Structures are given as C-alpha cells and as structure tokens.
Design a protein around this nucleic acid. Structure first.
Ligand SMILES: [Mg+2]
Ligand SMILES: [Mg+2]
Ligand SMILES: [Mg+2]
Ligand SMILES: [Mg+2]
Ligand SMILES: [Mg+2]
Ligand SMILES: [Mg+2]
Ligand SMILES: [Mg+2]
Ligand SMILES: [Mg+2]
Ligand SMILES: [Mg+2]
Ligand SMILES: [Mg+2]
Ligand SMILES: [Mg+2]
Ligand SMILES: [Mg+2]
Ligand SMILES: [Mg+2]
Ligand SMILES: [Mg+2]
Ligand SMILES: [Mg+2]
Ligand SMILES: [Mg+2]
Ligand SMILES: [Mg+2]
Ligand SMILES: [Mg+2]
Ligand SMILES: [Mg+2]
Ligand SMILES: [Mg+2]
Ligand SMILES: [Mg+2]
Ligand SMILES: [Mg+2]
Ligand SMILES: [Mg+2]
Ligand SMILES: [Mg+2]
Ligand SMILES: [Mg+2]
Ligand SMILES: [Mg+2]
Ligand SMILES: [Mg+2]
Ligand SMILES: [Mg+2]
Ligand SMILES: [Mg+2]
Ligand SMILES: [Mg+2]
Ligand SMILES: [Mg+2]
Ligand SMILES: [Mg+2]
Ligand SMILES: [Mg+2]
Lengths: 141, 197, 65, 110, 117
RNA sequence: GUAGGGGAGCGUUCAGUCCGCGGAGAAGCCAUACCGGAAGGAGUGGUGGAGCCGACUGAAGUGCGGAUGCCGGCAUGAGU
RNA sequence: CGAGCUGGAGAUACGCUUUGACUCGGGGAUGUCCGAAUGGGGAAACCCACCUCGUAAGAGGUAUCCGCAAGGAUGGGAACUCAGGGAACUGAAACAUCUCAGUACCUGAAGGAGAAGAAAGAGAAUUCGAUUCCGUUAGUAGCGGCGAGCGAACCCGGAUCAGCCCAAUCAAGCCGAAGUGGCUGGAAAGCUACACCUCAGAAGGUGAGAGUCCUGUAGGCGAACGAGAGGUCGUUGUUCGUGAAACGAUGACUGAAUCCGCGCGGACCACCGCGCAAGGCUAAAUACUCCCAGUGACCGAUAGCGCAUAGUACCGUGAGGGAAAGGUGAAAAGAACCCCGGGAGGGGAGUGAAAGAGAACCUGAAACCGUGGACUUACAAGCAGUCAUGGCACCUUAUGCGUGUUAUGGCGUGCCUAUUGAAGCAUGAGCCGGCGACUUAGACCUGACGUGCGAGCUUAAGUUGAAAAACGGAGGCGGAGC
C-alpha cells in the first residue's frame, strides 16, 4: 500500500453526459446529424454521397511479390565490429535477422581494415570498395 | 551487501536498484500482479437474454401511451441491463524486464530498510511450530510484524504455516506483492547469492 | 480485429520516406486524340496529392503496400 | 436453513447425561438430559425454568391457567461434566472393552 | 460490480428541499418544482445584490433632496455647492446628517450656498 | 458565453492495504443557525439494533427532472 | 452410525428402537393406469377382448421391421457434432450479380463426444510425411457491379500421436491439539491479568467479534457390498463471382489404360519432380455443459434465472405468453388473565434487555391524509421568487452576520427540448420514490502522457509450478530507398 503511481501515467477516462459541468446533453455530438446516431458504419472512406478519389484514379501496374533483399551495411561490418567475420550463423547472432530471404551487402559508409564477406548477393560498389580495402565476397554457386 | 545467519556470513554481492529505489515501477508491477489473478466473472444479461419474448407489446400508434417494442429493454424494470459487465480477463503480459527490476527493487527497498534477515540454516527441530516460534524469537522476531518465508525445506514451512503473523512462500514463486505485502522477508540465503549468479 | 487493407488501392496509391502519399495523373484512355501533346505526356506520369485528402489513403493500407 | 446444518446434525452428548450451562444467564448449572433434539440441535436440561400461559383452551380446563415448565436449549451452551472438576470440560474418545467405545476428559471417564 | 444510487439522490434532493422552505405550495415540497423555483431565485439573488446597491443610493438621494428643499435649496444645488466647497461627503452620510441631525444639515446647507455664489 | 476542445477535481460502490470505531451502540433515517471556491464534508442532539468511518491505490452496471420513459405508491377531478 | 425416531408440516392420539432403530452408503425384491404403448380401439391415463396354465383369486403372451435362430431397431436428450433442405430483413447509403450466410429455421442420424484419418497429398527444398486443435504466417498472396466488401495455404512453433486389415484409486464413516480468573453487558466469544496448542489461525454455529465450547480443519485410519478414372452438357466447392479455369464434386449422355502402366504439378506441350484412385475400422488431443463440485475487485429482494422459487396465479380455443412475492426474538418464552365490543381493534398485565420486537411482527425515506401550536390571512391582481425595512415569536453549531414567521416596498415572462427568434396560446410532464443511456472486444490502426530496455525492443500458442510466477524466439516491430 506504500506506493503511488507515476504522475501522468494514468489518465481518468471520459464519461460523457452527466451534468452541465460537464458535458451536458448531446455528448460531444451537437444537434442532430447522421453522426448523432447510435449506429455503426459510416465509414472512413465514404466521402459525400458521391464517387471517390479512391475510385476516380488510374490503376497502374499490378502486384508481383519477388525476392526482396535483406540489407547489410558497410558501417556495420566496419567500425568497431573488429572482424569476427561473417561466416553464416555468425552475422545472424549479431544484427541481421530474417530467414527465408537472401542477404545483400551494399555501401553507405567508408572502408578500411580487410574483411572477407559471406553474402547471397551484393552491389557493384560494395565488392569494389571491400576488395580495394583487402577482402573478398563469397557469392554462392 | 549484507550478512547471513546460521552457516556462512558472506552476502557482499547482490547489486541494487538505485537512484534510491522507485515507487512508480513498484506500484506498476503490483497493480499488474493483482490484476492478472482476477476471476473475470461479473456476468449480466442483455435484451437477447432476459427471457422476455420478442412480441410487439401493443399499438405503435393509437394508445395514448409512450411507444414500446419489447419488455426486454434497458429502460424497463425486469428487462436486460444496458452496459453491463460480461465475462472477460484483465490480464496482460508485463514485459520481463520490469518484473525483474521490480522484484529487485522490492528486495532492496527492504534491505536499506533494513528489514532483511539473510538465513543460512534454520534450527526448528522436526517440523514443529513451537520450534519456529522459538528460533524466530531468538533471531529478532518479536511478534509484531508480518514475515514472509522463502526457503526450500518442507520442515521449516510446516513450522511456519499456522503462524498468524507469518506467510510461507516456497521456492521461486516470489513477487513484489507478498514482499511489500509484509514487514519482513525471511530471505533466506541459499538461492540469493547464487541467484545473483 | 485486424484493419483490412483496401485492395481498392493496391495499384493506385503510394507511400514514401517522408510519409507523403503519391498517385498518378488522370486522362489517358479516351481523353486522347485531344490531345494536347504536353497533356498526353503529362498524364502518363505520377504525383503526390495535396494534403487534406492524404490521411484517408493512408488508412486504406496499414503495411504501406 | 437448519441448526444442526453446520454441526453435522451431531449430538456430542446424550439423553441422560448430566450437563452444565457454559454461556448465558444460567452460567453453570447441573442438569440431567431430559430431551436431546439433534437436527434442530436443541435440548432440555432440568435447569432453565419458564412461565408459560396455555391460553383459554376450554378442554381441558375451561379457563386457561399457567405453568412453570422449562424452555429447551441449544447444544452449544450445553457442557458435559468431569467427575473430578465438574466444569468447562472437553472430551476425548477412548475404548474400554471389547468394542465398547467411551469418553474421557483429561482424566477419564463419564 | 453494480452501484445503485442507493443514497446520493436522496442527499442531493434533501439539500434542495432544505434550501427550499417558506415556499408556497409544491415549491417547498416537491423536488423538481423546488430546484426549479431556485433557478429563478438565483437570477433574482445575483441581480438584486447589485440592484440594492442602486436602490439604497436612490433612498439616500430622496432624503437629501428633501433636506435641501426644507430650507430653500434644491438637491442638485445643495450637493453641487457641496462639491464646490469640496466638502467630499458620501451621500449615505448626508442622508444620515439630514434626517437624524438637524442643525448640522443647516450648516452644511449654508456652506453649499455660500460656495455656490 | 451555445455547439466544441482543454485543465483541476467532488460523491457511489466493489477491491488491496494501513489508521481504527462499534451492544456505554454500527450502517441507514430525522432535525439544525458550522466548514470548504463547488461538486461536498464535519460537530451535537433524536432514531435504530450489528455492523462501519477515515488515507492511499486499483477496477467500474459510478452521480437523472425530463425520453407521451419503466415499476410502485399516493394525490387531482370528488364526496362529484 | 449409536440414541433417539414417528417426511416437509410447525397437530393430536397411536407407537417403534441398545436383539441396534432413525439417518447414510450398497445391492435386491414389489412397481396399478397412461405415455415408443406394443393384443384391438380410443377424445393420453380409458373401453371391448382372444390364448396358455390356475380350484378360483391370479400370472404370462398376443405391434411392426432385420433375422435360421439367438438377437437387434422404435422413443427421449439443454446444448456439442455430422448430414438432406435452406431464408429473408440487412449492407452496397437506391437495386439485380453481391453481401448478409450455408447464418435463422426444418429435418435425418449418432455419441458421451462427434467429425476427420493412414496421401493418385501438400508442395518446390529433388523437403515434409494420416487426421482433428491452437499459435503463427496474415488482412500477405489473391476474390470482387476490381464496388461494398470477401480473404487462404505451404514453412516455422506447440497440443496429442497409430496406424490396422482385406478383393484375383474415488464412493459411507471413524480418530483427531490446546484457558481460566475477574470486568462491562439482557446475554461473552469482546475488555483484562496471566495461560497452553499448532502439520490444526479455512470456515460455520453459540444471547455482541471464540485458534484452545461445538461442528471442523492439518493429520491419521477407512469398509463385507461399491465404483475405476477420362470426356461432353447444367452447376458447385475451397481466396475461385466463367476469368487463361486447373482439380475435386455430382444430374444427364458417354463408361480408357492395369506396370515399356495410371493420377497431379491452376489453360495447354515437352522436360522434370510429388504420387498408387476404383474396399473398410481406428484411441488420442478438440466441442458442448441439463447435472456435480470449487472459487469470485458477480448480485442481495425494481438487483440476481422468470421465481428467495412458479412456468404457478393470471390472459390466450391454440401455439404460446406469464407476475409481485423475503426478515418477530437470542430463544415462542407466541401474550393465561382483567377491561370497552357481536367482532374487528385496542388499553393494561405478564414474558423479554427491548412489546420504542406482539404475529398487517428489522430498519420505516418521499409523495399523500390528518391533530395540535406559533405567527398570519376576508379592498385583493399573483411563474409565487428575490431584495429592503417594520412587526411578532423563539434561543442545544443559538443573543447576532441570528433563526421561524409575517406586513409594506422595490424588482421580477416556469423548466426542458426545438429554434432566425420561447413566459409562450409550440414539444414533454399529476406528484414522489426506485430502475434508466457513450460501453465491451481485438493482442487491428493512429496519436498524447508515462514507463522498462534502447540500435536495439518483444513474445504467442504452450510447458511446468501455482496461497506465487518462470520458462517458452515460432513469429512481430525497427533496420534502405526507388
Ligand atoms: Mg471535459
Ligand atoms: Mg436532441
Ligand atoms: Mg440542423
Ligand atoms: Mg396522455
Ligand atoms: Mg452604480
Ligand atoms: Mg475497503
Ligand atoms: Mg456497507
Ligand atoms: Mg420521472
Ligand atoms: Mg398533454
Ligand atoms: Mg353534496
Ligand atoms: Mg364538477
Ligand atoms: Mg351536481
Ligand atoms: Mg444418526
Ligand atoms: Mg403385487
Ligand atoms: Mg394400446
Ligand atoms: Mg432487400
Ligand atoms: Mg441498402
Ligand atoms: Mg434421435
Ligand atoms: Mg465445367
Ligand atoms: Mg463456383
Ligand atoms: Mg474434374
Ligand atoms: Mg428493501
Ligand atoms: Mg426479481
Ligand atoms: Mg383482542
Ligand atoms: Mg393549524
Ligand atoms: Mg378600494
Ligand atoms: Mg385587508
Ligand atoms: Mg436535460
Ligand atoms: Mg420555427
Ligand atoms: Mg400557458
Ligand atoms: Mg407549453
Ligand atoms: Mg413538433
Ligand atoms: Mg512512448
């Protein structure tokens, strides 16, 4: 019973109606309207009576899923990672986690100390700037 | 950093939750814990339920009376409740992190108390209560506080059970509640420095 | 329950970085032989809406795609 | 809701037995058991006393009349006795014979 | 858990009905008419606070006018010659002087007139 | 100052916990000229007969003059 | 079990039982008539029979279908499950495809569950490996007057595991520790001075609150009996609305190969993969809850089921609808007896602590009706108040800022809702009680406050323990845009 709650960490709700204090009558709702009505459904994309922007517009293209590539960054194999190398499960037990996708390595930062990579694919400038700083890139067969 | 009782005398480990213990995270974990264990049970009926058949009762216009449809209605005596409680469950999963930090902060709050008694032994003969009362008496347990046991020895509990001024928490099942719920923690000692690590 | 994505919109509106929503320009099926040249060219494209009529779109999809 | 309900309709004593009133006005008095009603958990000790008026009832007796007889009681101010002490006197159950069961105190028996 | 009015309403209500006494018929006895009567009563209280501040001022005034005229002075002329000789008296007091204190009012008169001409 | 958004709070129950009262009398009810800025809350007196106030915290079937609202009681019309 | 019993029921008289009753557990025997009714009929509970044995009194049999017989079926069951049949209101702000929804309802069958099930499968890894269930993938892939809206599965984590065969311990009960003295009180359990028990401080009863009176609990025992193929045409199913329509699925027409063979991989073709149709059963996890038990930030008499009990009273030709109902006391000690009256009712008495509990029996609010008293009121015009003064009265938050009442004055258009505008001759309402309306759900969306970890944050289903919680990385959010 000692304790107490963090100042502002629990706000007391609104119970609308109840007095002129107070939220008299109406309950926020004003006077009449379709809004006034105890009834579901309005909803949120229902502009006017009308026809919507939503359906007034060109349907371009379609929808392909595709293979989407998991980001690996330079400044993350770099800086103070002190090359424990990429291996396989190693980068997983660090900071690049998904499954059921292939990993990609691309630029962003700068390059120094020599490292060999173990990725499923990579950008041209990436293999470029990592070989030119002392290390390979293992692309599968 | 605090002393034991019947075996060793170590206790200098166990780091603690400063600035100077927090009331907020406590109250959080407590009220949470209290919630998690409620029976979720207050059922009432609505119109669909109140055995009060659909049938239009009388004339939609004509009678000189206010208009009604059914007798199963919120404005009727007898009828169903409007906005009543139903069976639910006020439980959630408070994130690990703060369970640990609470628990801790409780222990602590009672160490700088200092209502801790770190215990390495227990001399309570064979499972008898009077022996508990005696041992107790000689560790500093006047009789004017609520005391919470945590050990692992069936005998000591069986001794610590009927005691009006004491509660008996077995092994791990320990919580910010019970502890703050009380005046004293029977620490014990065994799973304290090793539960540190 | 889980707020449905408006498949009405899965080929006609786009999110971004800043959060802004884009869509295309309109008039490219019988608004043709008109023409004019910079019209027909202008309309194949794409563009960000104003504001006011933004949030709606957003609420049409949760994933942003 | 019955009175022996919470008392497993159980009469700890018996018709005959001497008794002493624990709590009440009749604190401590002796009485043979004249009537022991287990379910209602009610019972008559020769102590109690009461003055009852049995109304007109022409037959028998034209006029009414009255009567000094005694109001029954609740087996929970009834107490069995200890021949030695004779007071507030619990009971243990032991075995004399020979599959005959009996009843001591802290110094048997009764 | 459910929570009947139980008690609260009787409380509120009595509060009103205890404000509500001396009132003629139903007003003093039924809640609705009572509370109601009191809405209007509210209006009358507020306004009539400032109002009485007016009314009294009026009263003092007519008494002074009297006073002046009791010799040969107008109210306006008396009070004006009592602004002129700077005799900065409240008029409530002036009424008091005027009706409870004769020869004093006499002098204040002679003064005002002097300062007037 | 109307619709409206914002701010601080009053009361009701159930609940955790502490202060604690009660057959030399609990709650509830009844009277009143005390207190608080207001929701409200205290003092004492009469009622009653066995339970309850206060602080902090939590959760709500949480505050009614209206709905020709619902249940119940009692008035008018009428000694007609 | 061991002393009382003779049902609620509260009444007399009759009795019964320590040779063991009454109550309890466990079997048996007897069980009229109706009802699947079933010997035939019938307007259910009634009518009339025929046959076998009996001395009669009686007893049995006499439906229909599957069967050689023996034997099984009929009818009922709140929901739960499967199947044949299958609505509409509604939404799309109109409607018709569509959505409501294979929902409501009807029906058939069946069980304590059921269904489903042992791959011509998912499928895309040349991986998994019967089903049902939950988590998740996932509002993703897709469906759609591409509108409203509709919405998977594989993988990944759990629950529980099974695969077999054929045709050439609880249910009655017993036993269980430890306090007395004084005090208030009508009454001790409370106050108090000293006590003892605890594997027992859960609870309930006892004249007011009992660890140590009682029944119990922790614990310990515990029974004779007792329970454990293809194709075509019209269609449809899955996210499947004729769309490129695969596949299954059947109504009508057609009815191929059987191993160098058959089926699928979403038109279709080769290739290359996964597979063995035409035969059956299958526990387990899962669903429900009439019923039994345990609990409760569920209700306590307008609540809670409709019912403190009743589907009754009452309404209805019927289907069907369908109430309000609670409290003397600690114990009947239930008021002998005198008084006015035919009575009803009351006034004593007497009991009790209290009859300020007396059977219209706990409190006893308000509207509403009255008796008495104060101050007032019969030349007066009124939303009934206000505010100022005088009169009279009173003195337990109370002799001054008084309180009650009043006369005279000034002043003054009930409330609510609806409105450009309400005293409105515009809506509502006899009065007072009590019931009466902005909520809940989702691990959805987006924000404000807060918090814990912080380039890191987090579990869900479940598992184990459970007077507590911990485990659980499967997935989720952040990480890079176009
Ligand atoms: Mg507000
Ligand atoms: Mg309105
Ligand atoms: Mg309007
Ligand atoms: Mg009318
Ligand atoms: Mg002025
Ligand atoms: Mg409380
Ligand atoms: Mg209460
Ligand atoms: Mg009303
Ligand atoms: Mg009318
Ligand atoms: Mg007449
Ligand atoms: Mg008339
Ligand atoms: Mg007449
Ligand atoms: Mg018995
Ligand atoms: Mg017979
Ligand atoms: Mg027949
Ligand atoms: Mg229609
Ligand atoms: Mg429509
Ligand atoms: Mg059937
Ligand atoms: Mg076809
Ligand atoms: Mg179809
Ligand atoms: Mg096919
Ligand atoms: Mg009541
Ligand atoms: Mg009811
Ligand atoms: Mg009489
Ligand atoms: Mg009078
Ligand atoms: Mg006149
Ligand atoms: Mg007159
Ligand atoms: Mg209103
Ligand atoms: Mg108008
Ligand atoms: Mg009028
Ligand atoms: Mg009107
Ligand atoms: Mg109108
Ligand atoms: Mg935040």
């Amino acid at each position: 019973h000692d304790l107490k709650p963090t100042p502002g960490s629990r706000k007391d709700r609104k119970r609308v109606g109840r007095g002129p204090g107070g939220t008299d009558k109406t309950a926020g709702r004003g006077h009449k309207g379709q809004k006034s009505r105890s009834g579901a459904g309005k909803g949120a994309f229902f502009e006017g009576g009308r026809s919507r922007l939503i359906a007034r517009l060109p349907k371009r293209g379609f929808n392909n899923v595709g293979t989407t590539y998991e980001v690996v960054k330079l400044s993350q194999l770099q800086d103070l990672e002190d090359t424990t190398f990429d291996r396989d499960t190693l980068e997983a037990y660090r900071l690049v986690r998904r499954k059921n996708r292939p990993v990609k390595l691309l630029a962003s930062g700068e390059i120094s100390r020599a490292v060999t990579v173990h990725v499923d694919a990579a950008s041209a400038a990436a293999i470029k700037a990592v070989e030119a700083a002392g290390g390979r890139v293992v692309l599968p067969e | 950093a605090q002393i034991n009782v019947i075996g060793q005398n170590g206790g200098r480990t166990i780091e603690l939750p400063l600035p100077e213990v927090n009331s907020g995270v406590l109250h959080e974990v407590v009220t949470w814990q209290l919630a998690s264990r409620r029976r979720g049970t207050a059922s009432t009926r609505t119109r669909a339920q109140v055995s009060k058949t659909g049938r239009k009762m009388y004339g939609q216009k004509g009678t000189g009376n206010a208009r009604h449809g059914d007798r199963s209605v919120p404005t009727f005596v007898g009828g169903g409740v409007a906005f009543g409680p139903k069976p639910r469950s006020y439980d959630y999963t408070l994130p690990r992190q703060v369970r640990q930090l609470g628990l801790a902060m409780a222990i602590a709050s009672r160490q700088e108390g200092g209502k801790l008694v770190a215990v390495d032994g227990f001399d309570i003969a064979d499972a008898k209560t009077k022996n508990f009362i005696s041992w107790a008496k000689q560790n500093g347990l006047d009789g004017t506080e609520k005391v919470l046991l945590v050990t692992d020895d069936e005998n000591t509990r069986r001794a610590a059970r009927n005691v009006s001024w004491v509660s008996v928490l077995p092994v791990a099942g320990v919580n910010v509640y019970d502890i703050l719920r009380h005046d004293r923690l029977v620490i014990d000692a065994a799973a304290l420095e090793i539960v540190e690590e | 329950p889980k707020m449905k994505t408006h498949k009405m919109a899965k080929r006609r509106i786009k999110i971004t970085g800043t959060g802004k929503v884009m869509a295309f320009k309109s008039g490219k099926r019988h608004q043709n032989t008109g023409k004019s040249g910079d019209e027909i060219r202008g309309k194949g494209k794409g563009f960000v809406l104003a504001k006011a009529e933004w949030a709606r779109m957003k609420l049409m999809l949760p994933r942003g795609k | 809701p019955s009175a022996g309900s919470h008392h497993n309709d159980k009469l700890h004593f018996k018709k005959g037995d001497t008794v002493i009133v624990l709590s009440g006005k009749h604190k401590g008095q002796t009485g043979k058991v004249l009537l022991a009603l287990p379910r209602d958990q009610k019972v008559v000790v020769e102590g109690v006393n009461v003055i009852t008026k049995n109304v007109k009832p022409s037959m028998t007796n034209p006029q009414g009349g009255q009567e000094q007889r005694e109001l029954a009681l609740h087996a929970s101010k009834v107490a069995l006795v200890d021949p030695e002490t004779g007071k507030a006197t619990r009971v243990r159950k032991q075995i004399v014979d020979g599959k005959k069961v009996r009843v001591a105190v802290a110094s048997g028996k009764t | 858990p459910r929570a009947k009015t139980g008690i609260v309403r009787r409380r509120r209500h009595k509060k009103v009905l205890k404000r509500a006494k001396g009132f003629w018929g139903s007003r003093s006895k039924q809640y609705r008419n009572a509370f109601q009567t009191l809405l209007n009563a509210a209006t009358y209280e507020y306004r009539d606070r400032r109002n009485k501040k007016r009314d009294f001022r009026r009263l003092w005034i007519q008494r002074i006018n009297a006073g002046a005229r009791l010799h040969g002075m107008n109210y306006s002329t008396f009070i004006n010659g009592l602004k002129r000789a700077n005799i900065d008296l409240n008029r409530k007091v002036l009424a008091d002087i005027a009706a409870r204190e004769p020869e004093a009012f006499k002098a204040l008169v002679d003064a005002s007139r002097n300062a007037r001409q």
